[PDB]
Symmetry: C2
């Protein structure tokens, strides 16, 4: 796991056994952590971590979409 | 529609007729726009807009989760 994958709890999000509602709970949670980062300050490091979170989440949803479309 | 709802194309994302894969396409797209904002600069205004995007998306996925769980 990368830092973002582990921190955002995403290492199973592209498992198709996970229902849509549960998936939406994981995404919501990840987005709220991004919102939180962006609410504190606008330091470069903070902004860069939020960008890693966003990108990691996007990449995982593309992976999930792939797994889902397979079936 | 708010600025973020319209810009991120989210005004139907909590419609249950929209399939999961299509939903994931809308979320991915929204997250990529957040990544893009956070990749340019760390000005307060830029950071605040990205935070609006993130929050708006999260709120819409909670709404979608609600609509889905209803059925």
């Amino acid at each position: 796991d990368t830092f973002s994958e582990r921190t955002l709890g995403l290492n199973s999000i592209d498992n198709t056994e996970i229902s849509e509602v549960v998936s939406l709970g994981l995404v919501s949670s990840a987005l709220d952590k991004i919102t939180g980062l962006l609410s504190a300050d606008n330091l470069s490091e903070t902004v860069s971590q939020a960008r890693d979170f966003s990108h990691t989440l996007s990449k995982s949803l593309k992976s999930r979409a792939k797994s889902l479309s397979q079936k």
